[PDB]
Design a protein around this ligand. Structure first.
Ligand code: HEM
Ligand code: HEM
Ligand SMILES: CN[C@H](C)Cc1cc(C#N)cc(OCc2ccc3c(C)cc(N)nc3c2)c1
Ligand SMILES: CN[C@H](C)Cc1cc(C#N)cc(OCc2ccc3c(C)cc(N)nc3c2)c1
Ligand SMILES: C[C@H](O)[C@H](O)[C@H]1CNc2nc(N)[nH]c(=O)c2N1
Ligand SMILES: C[C@H](O)[C@H](O)[C@H]1CNc2nc(N)[nH]c(=O)c2N1
Ligand SMILES: [Zn+2]
Lengths: 410, 415
């Protein structure tokens, strides 16, 4: 069936046909919706239909479906699976695949940018040192002195599962977190465990509030190895406020480059367990979640104090006031330093225009309202009033288990 | 379907186990391949005899199970009597105890409601003896006066006769018992509340003389026993209102805003044991953001963000200054302050969401689950700094339930 989605602000109605193409499951059933669950629950014979599906849509995309090149590619891929239990993507295919995993990422509000993705092919990498070099080149290219550029670096595909490439970091650039004797936490609490693993593996921690973590890199299933990203490659922004001169005294800072490194990229049945991808920040990622989550830096108290707000009763909305001032500061700081950042109004507005684009040229756009709507000021952004259909298309980015739960060492 | 489903809270690491989803009765709209969780809503005939039997049994079973009399003589006798009623009259009547139980549970089962910790405290008014629109007016006035209670609001529901053949429906045409009029102008602008322009137009056609102001309380438009609906003015002394002012900003009162104290939704259908109560106005008290974010700051509503921001002398040239967010907070501060000052019950979104988490935990423990719609439960501002943002939720449909129904002017056969 054709499915309609309505914007209750603009009364615009879109018709979704694209969902008919999806084959992966969402987790919901006719009787139970699991839309707010974070993660709802190969062989030769499995592999070829997935390969064929992907090759077909690639040649469909370049308007050469059923061509000589198409026919021959199908042939080629089948001999390669038969004789080696897997196959290799052409470079064009790799690029097509990576862009479309981004395009299909229902939880990403930044997808208007999807076809502007710099794809670095690192499938010839064999060691952790090689991984480090590739990652440094990625970071340097994507940072571009503040004029951030979207990029993905793709390491060799999974083979037998015992020879995985993995970036153990969840992002290429993150701050360490230290569990105090106090019982409290210095730095970023989200990373306390990873930090402990780095220390255990020989990393000498500065024990500051914003210590950049080392890279911890696993090549071909071997034990991971530690590397320091050269400091000059790590662009950082000191957070100050355009009116509160005391804000700089808080000593806050953050890094310019968000580069997620712990997801899995799947294309045509092949699995890329190491594929760090990066873009630029939406301000709330830092200002709302990274700084104000109770389980994160948790600075609301300190700010509201410096703002001399009455914090006895919750109905004074002192938290809400402090939250807005923090996000103002973050946006102002990045902008003053000419580091690319987008506010949640501009981003969601861009996403609405993107949905309209996709419905017109593609027959729909999979989108996850729970993640698309920003973590503050929800209903005064246009996505709040936008009905969305969430479904799973491939190529995709998938979650995978943390390496320290699978890997067995020396 | 799996017997045990787990939900996690990503802030506290607490994991809860849901078994209640097994009692799910209706569909959600979702499938294995698509999720419709952000769709707002995923013939004039009635339940046949054969349709009605198992629906009634299911409900009667559940009622006798709740009073710890399952399998009792009284339980079996009640089943027999209901069955005979359905067989001889193709419908049946609920006992007062059952009616009260059913209403309370429709609320308990309402996945989109953040206020459900209060579900067992609901004054139920039985109006199944009502025959006319004047009588409906009488019941509604008594409902309003009771629930308002001079600002100390008390949750209540008034239940009018159930549907029979569908040509004798009782309906409140209003969407809430108390709402302000909206007037479209010839120049295309709107006076009052833009959400209510269509209903306002219907009232004016029905004979209502409109004051044409910014905050004109609408008349009740009341349909009894399938007859043409009739207009009634709610006695102004029964309509509690709060003028909105701000603790710091003296100029805020000059904006001339006010709102009414009693939120009383009147266009939903109450479904119990297969019976349909098409007129069942229910009321509680407000969460601040219902007024301060949606009513006032929605673009298609009163839309005051600009005027507030201008009086705050905010830089409104670039969105990245977050002038909208700044203004939104002050407005919501004003709403909570004005209600508290006038001693009219209201709850802020931090307190409400914290109570909902405690409520949800309790329901998982005592009931085996709590259906919840994250998309509606999370408040329209400051989402992630409330504890429901990080709380995984399962959504499913239990009966008794509150349901959407078509607007009555779309289906009514005018006499
Ligand atoms: C270019 C600017 C971009 C912006 C502003 C942006 C914005 C966002 C935001 C705000 C989120 C939610 C993050 C969270 O709350 O944890 C997100 C999720 C996501 N983004 Fe984007 N993004 C951008 C680029 C990209 C790129 C280049 C990729 C991949 C090639 C990508 C893939 C994803 C994926 C896969 C998710 C969801 C991951 C999950 O399911 O947990 N994004 N994005
Ligand atoms: C006692 C204080 C109450 C509070 C603070 C409260 C709060 C809320 C809020 C904020 C919403 C979302 C409304 C929206 O955004 O449109 C809601 C929805 C809802 N409430 Fe409650 N409520 C209360 C009482 C009640 C009562 C007494 C009932 C019925 C007996 C009820 C039944 C419902 C239903 C069915 C919805 C969903 C309506 C829909 O699906 O459109 N609530 N509530
Ligand atoms: C506490 N929040 C947790 C870490 C949720 C999360 C998990 C994973 C994984 N695996 C990956 C995640 O990535 C979100 C994401 C991914 C890519 C992004 C890019 C490329 C840019 C950007 N501005 N934000 C992103 C945000 C998030
Ligand atoms: C413009 N948005 C529309 C009006 C959404 C909506 C539709 C319907 C219906 N039918 C019913 C709705 O009810 C929400 C509701 C219901 C009862 C409430 C009670 C009893 C108290 C309270 N504070 N809010 C409520 C909020 C909402
Ligand atoms: C499109 C979206 O489903 C729609 O705007 C919903 C979102 N969440 C909501 N949540 C509440 N509480 N009230 C609403 O009216 C809505 N609207
Ligand atoms: C339980 C809930 O699904 C979880 O907190 C989600 C909600 N929405 C989110 N939305 C975004 N953008 N990022 C998140 O991490 C989350 N967390
Ligand atoms: Zn769903």
């Amino acid at each position: 069936r054709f499915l309609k989605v309505k914007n209750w602000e603009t009364e615009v109605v879109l018709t979704d046909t694209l969902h008919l193409k999806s084959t992966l499951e969402t987790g919901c059933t006719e009787y139970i919706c699991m839309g707010s669950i974070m993660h709802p629950s190969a062989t030769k014979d499995q592999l070829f239909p997935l390969a064929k599906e992907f090759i077909d849509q690639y040649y469909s995309s370049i308007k050469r479906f059923g061509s000589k090149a198409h026919m021959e590619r199908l042939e080629e891929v089948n001999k390669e699976i038969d004789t080696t239990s897997t196959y290799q993507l052409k470079d064009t295919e790799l690029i097509y695949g990576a862009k479309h995993a981004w395009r299909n990422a229902s939880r990403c509000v930044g997808r208007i940018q999807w076809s502007k993705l710099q794809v670095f092919d690192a499938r010839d990498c064999t060691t952790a040192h090689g991984m480090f070099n590739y990652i440094c080149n990625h970071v340097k290219y994507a940072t571009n002195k503040g004029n951030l550029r979207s990029a993905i670096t793709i390491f060799p595909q999974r083979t037998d599962g015992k020879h995985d490439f993995r970036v153990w970091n969840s992002q290429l650039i993150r701050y360490a977190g230290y569990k105090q004797p106090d019982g409290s936490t210095l730095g970023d609490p989200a990373n306390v465990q990873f930090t402990e693993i780095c220390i255990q593996q020989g990393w000498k921690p500065p024990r500051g509030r914003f210590d950049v973590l080392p890279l911890l890199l696993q090549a071909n299933g071997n034990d991971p190895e530690l590397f320091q990203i050269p400091p000059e490659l790590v662009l950082e922004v000191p957070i100050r406020h355009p009116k509160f001169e005391w804000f700089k005294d808080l000593g806050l800072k953050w890094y310019g480059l968000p580069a997620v490194s712990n997801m899995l990229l799947e294309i045509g049945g092949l699995e890329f367990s190491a594929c760090p991808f990066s873009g630029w920040y939406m301000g709330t990622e830092i200002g709302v979640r990274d700084y104000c989550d109770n389980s994160r830096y948790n600075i609301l108290e300190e700010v509201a104090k410096k703002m001399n707000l009455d914090m006895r009763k919750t109905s004074s909305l002192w938290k809400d006031q402090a939250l807005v001032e923090i996000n103002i500061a973050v946006l102002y700081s990045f902008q003053s330093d000419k580091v690319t950042i987008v506010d949640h109004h501009s981003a969601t507005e861009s996403f609405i225009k993107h949905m309209e684009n996709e419905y017109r040229c593609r027959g729909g756009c999979p989108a996850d309202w729970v993640w698309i709507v920003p973590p503050m000021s929800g209903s005064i952004t246009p996505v709040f009033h936008q009905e969305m259909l969430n479904y799973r298309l491939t190529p995709s980015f998938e979650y995978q288990p943390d390496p320290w739960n699978t890997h067995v060492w020396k």
